[PDB]
Amino acid sequence: LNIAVLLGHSHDVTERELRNLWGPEQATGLPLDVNVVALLMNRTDPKSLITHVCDLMSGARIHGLV
Amino acid sequence: EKENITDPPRGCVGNTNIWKTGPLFKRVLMSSKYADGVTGRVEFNEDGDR
Amino acid sequence: GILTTAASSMLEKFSYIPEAKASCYGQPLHTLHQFMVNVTWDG
Amino acid sequence: KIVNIGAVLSTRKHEQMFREAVNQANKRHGSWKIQLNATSVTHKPNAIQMALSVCEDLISSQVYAILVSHPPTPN
């Protein structure tokens, strides 16, 4: 389903490899409406954590938080 | 009455560094001995209870 | 891979897999909490 | 200087005696330069918005002690 992966600044990880992390892979994709959303965030304070969690849960009903 | 007076900053805007005198202020709360009160003689134990 | 494997293996068990909450404002039957205890992916 | 004191504190009788106790803390402690400043947040049945009220009312307030004083919740 809709699954959100969000990171900060660890290991200098960008987002383009996370776009290309699932696309050509997952040959055994049985459900249809499965999408991934990769995001970065500068601030890991709990105000913005709860804010982005509510934004992604309101963001087309994301069922998995990473 | 003590030194190293530090304050917990605006941690909701770009701050993740913890407040270093947290256990210091907690130890101040641990040594809170009182003999006044309508409920009675209030004092925190080693577990922080009445 | 663990999330998609649990979702695909729960789709064969139960049909209505997407069951989410709309928003944080304005105030459980089959979850993957009790499903992916036995999971192994990519060996 | 000034100290914000925040609490989950809605029913106005303990607003009144809380402001009274703020006045009494600046009364029986001499004429020291510290001042007090109250902060009160109200009921939310959803605890997510309780934490929302806590974070957008108490972090910028720089409070030192937070008191939950509402037992009889219907949930």
Ligand SMILES: *[C@@H]1O[C@H](CO)[C@@H](O)[C@H](O)[C@H]1NC(C)=O
């Ligand atoms: C985070 O925000 C600060 C202040 O605007 C800025 O200096 C810093 O470069 C930002 N980090 C990134 C890369 O988002």
Ligand SMILES: *[C@@H]1O[C@H](CO)[C@@H](O)[C@H](O)[C@H]1NC(C)=O
């Ligand atoms: C504050 O604490 C430090 C140790 O953490 C101590 O060295 C110092 O003497 C204290 N206060 C000051 C700045 O004198």
Ligand SMILES: *[C@@H]1O[C@H](CO)[C@@H](O)[C@H](O)[C@H]1NC(C)=O
């Ligand atoms: C002890 O019990 C008495 C009688 O209820 C009352 O003073 C109060 O509840 C308690 N505290 C003290 C030490 O007086």
Ligand SMILES: *[C@@H]1O[C@H](CO)[C@@H](O)[C@H](O)[C@H]1NC(C)=O
């Ligand atoms: C794995 O766990 C699930 C939990 O529902 C169970 O249904 C399934 O039989 C288990 N698979 C085996 C055979 O180990």
Ligand SMILES: *[C@@H]1O[C@H](CO)[C@@H](O)[C@H](O)[C@H]1NC(C)=O
């Ligand atoms: C002091 O107390 C009042 C009580 O409503 C509060 O609204 C205010 O934020 C506090 N002082 C300031 C200017 O922050």
